[PDB]
């Protein structure tokens, strides 16, 4: 076979092992997740907007007591006003309250006021994938496989929970001091012990069951993983158009073209990533997340040391203090202004 | 030619 007698034993051991972390895992997540107002505006300065959404923005902030500093995500309430907006953002804050993996961002505190939601996380000072990508232009299949095997392990983390994740993009994934990845941006994260029907993402990384409003599952993650590989290792997607609608069609047609640079054993992966035909898409067969980290790309990785942070990082972003934000690009401020009446209050009693 | 700034999720197709 391929592996020897001594490989082989090492790979079952491997896997029951698994079993063994991911047992334990579900028990401490379940005890937050039924067991979950730990701050207030005024106890934290306002310094830099990190980034914009639909809903608000993330700011830098310090706190004002310890130094410390926080990205803290602010929602408009009434602009969380599509009805799939409000259990959404509910989602997002009982799951990050809940969950803890190397790869995920720390939420520390979450708050509300009149006018807003806040959720305040651990600040991650070397920026997003994006902009690293796009200004060197590709990852090397080295440096792409280093990220996607920590995005692999996450979703193992995520879907044992049954969680799904829903947004995977380079927008999403900030690089930290050691050059490992933390996921942010929960707001489509969502427990789903089968099927769910919400029709969100972001276009160039949505599954085609999803364009095709039919009810779909946690293998729209590795559809997603298929799409992020691909345009970390090519430096744009495999469905680019200018406009959403052809997207959609490029996603359902079941064509994908690779760029000639791209190894035999990476167009392989990503055929059977990028499937769609659910019978036959890696991750949702039957032995699951295990047709992916053994494939032929994944034979370099060691999977327990990418987890305990053991490989050296392809890249480590620059960091001149505590609050840098060079990092990141600049945006447009416009002050945190809260009414004196209180909005949408029966709406986010749960918040 | 495609999308070569940052990408907004959807909240409906
Ligand atoms: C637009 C946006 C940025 C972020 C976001 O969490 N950034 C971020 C940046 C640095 N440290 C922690 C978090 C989100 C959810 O949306």
Same mark, same amino acid.
């Given at each position: 076979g391929?592996?020897?007698?001594?490989?082989?034993?090492?790979?079952?051991?491997?896997?029951?092992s698994?079993?063994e972390?991911?047992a334990?895992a579900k028990?401490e997540f379940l005890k937050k997740?039924?067991?979950?107002?730990?701050a207030?505006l005024? *106890?934290f300065?306002?310094?830099?907007?990190?980034? /914009?959404?639909s809903?608000?923005?993330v700011? %830098?902030?310090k706190?004002?007591?310890?130094?410390? *500093?926080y990205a803290?995500?602010?929602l408009?309430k009434?602009k969380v006003?599509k009805?799939?907006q409000?259990?959404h953002t509910?989602?997002?804050?009982?799951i %990050?309250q809940?969950?803890?993996?190397?790869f995920?961002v720390?939420?520390?505190?979450?708050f509300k006021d009149?006018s807003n939601?806040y959720?305040?996380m651990?600040?991650?000072?070397?920026?997003?994938m994006?902009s *690293?990508?796009?200004?060197?232009?590709?990852f090397?299949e080295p440096?792409a496989?280093?990220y996607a095997?920590?995005?692999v392990?996450?979703?193992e983390?995520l879907?044992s929970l049954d969680?799904?994740?829903?947004?995977?993009k380079?927008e999403? #994934?900030?690089?930290?001091?050691?050059?490992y990845?933390?996921?942010?941006?929960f707001?489509?994260?969502?427990?789903?012990?089968?099927? /769910?029907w919400?029709l +969100?993402?972001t276009?160039e990384?949505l599954?085609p069951?999803?364009?095709?409003?039919?009810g779909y599952?946690?293998a729209?993650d590795?559809?997603?993983?298929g799409?992020?590989?691909?345009?970390?290792?090519?430096?744009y997607?495999?469905?680019?158009?200018?406009?959403?609608?052809?997207?959609?069609?490029?996603?359902?047609?079941?064509?994908?073209?690779?760029?000639?640079?791209?190894?035999?054993?990476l167009?392989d #992966?990503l055929?059977?990533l990028?499937?769609?035909?659910?019978?036959?898409?890696?991750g949702n067969?039957?032995?699951?997340?295990?047709?992916?980290?053994n *494939?032929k790309?994944?034979? /370099?990785?060691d999977?327990?040391?990418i987890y305990?942070?053991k490989?050296?990082?392809p890249?480590?972003?620059?960091?001149?203090?505590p609050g840098?934000?060079?990092?990141?690009d600049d945006?447009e401020?416009?002050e945190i202004?809260?009414?004196?009446?209180?909005? +949408?209050?029966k709406?986010?009693t749960?918040? | 030619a495609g999308?070569t700034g940052?990408?907004?999720?959807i909240?409906?197709?």
């Amino acid at each position: 076979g391929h592996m020897g007698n001594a490989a082989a034993a090492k790979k079952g051991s491997e896997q029951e092992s698994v079993k063994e972390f991911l047992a334990k895992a579900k028990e401490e997540f379940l005890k937050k997740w039924e067991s979950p107002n730990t701050a207030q505006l005024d *106890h934290f300065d306002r310094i830099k907007t990190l980034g /914009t959404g639909s809903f608000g923005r993330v700011m %830098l902030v310090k706190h004002k007591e310890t130094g410390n *500093h926080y990205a803290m995500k602010i929602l408009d309430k009434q602009k969380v006003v599509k009805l799939k907006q409000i259990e959404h953002t509910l989602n997002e804050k009982r799951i %990050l309250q809940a969950v803890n993996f190397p790869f995920l961002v720390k939420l520390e505190f979450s708050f509300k006021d009149n006018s807003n939601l806040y959720m305040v996380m651990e600040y991650v000072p070397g920026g997003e994938m994006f902009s *690293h990508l796009r200004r060197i232009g590709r990852f090397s299949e080295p440096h792409a496989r280093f990220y996607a095997a920590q995005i692999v392990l996450t979703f193992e983390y995520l879907h044992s929970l049954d969680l799904i994740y829903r947004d995977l993009k380079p927008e999403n #994934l900030l690089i930290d001091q050691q050059g490992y990845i933390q996921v942010t941006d929960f707001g489509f994260a969502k427990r789903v012990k089968g099927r /769910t029907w919400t029709l +969100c993402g972001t276009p160039e990384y949505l599954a085609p069951e999803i364009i095709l409003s039919k009810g779909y599952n946690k293998a729209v993650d590795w559809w997603a993983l298929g799409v992020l590989i691909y345009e970390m290792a090519a430096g744009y997607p495999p469905f680019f158009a200018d406009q959403p609608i052809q997207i959609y069609e490029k996603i359902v047609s079941g064509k994908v073209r690779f760029p000639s640079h791209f190894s035999s054993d990476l167009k392989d #992966l990503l055929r059977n990533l990028l499937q769609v035909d659910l019978t036959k898409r890696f991750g949702n067969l039957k032995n699951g997340v295990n047709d992916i980290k053994n *494939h032929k790309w994944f034979a /370099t990785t060691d999977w327990i040391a990418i987890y305990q942070r053991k490989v050296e990082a392809p890249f480590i972003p620059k960091f001149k203090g505590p609050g840098d934000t060079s990092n990141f690009d600049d945006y447009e401020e416009e002050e945190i202004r809260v009414s004196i009446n209180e909005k +949408c209050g029966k709406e986010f009693t749960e918040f | 030619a495609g999308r070569t700034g940052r990408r907004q999720a959807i909240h409906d197709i």
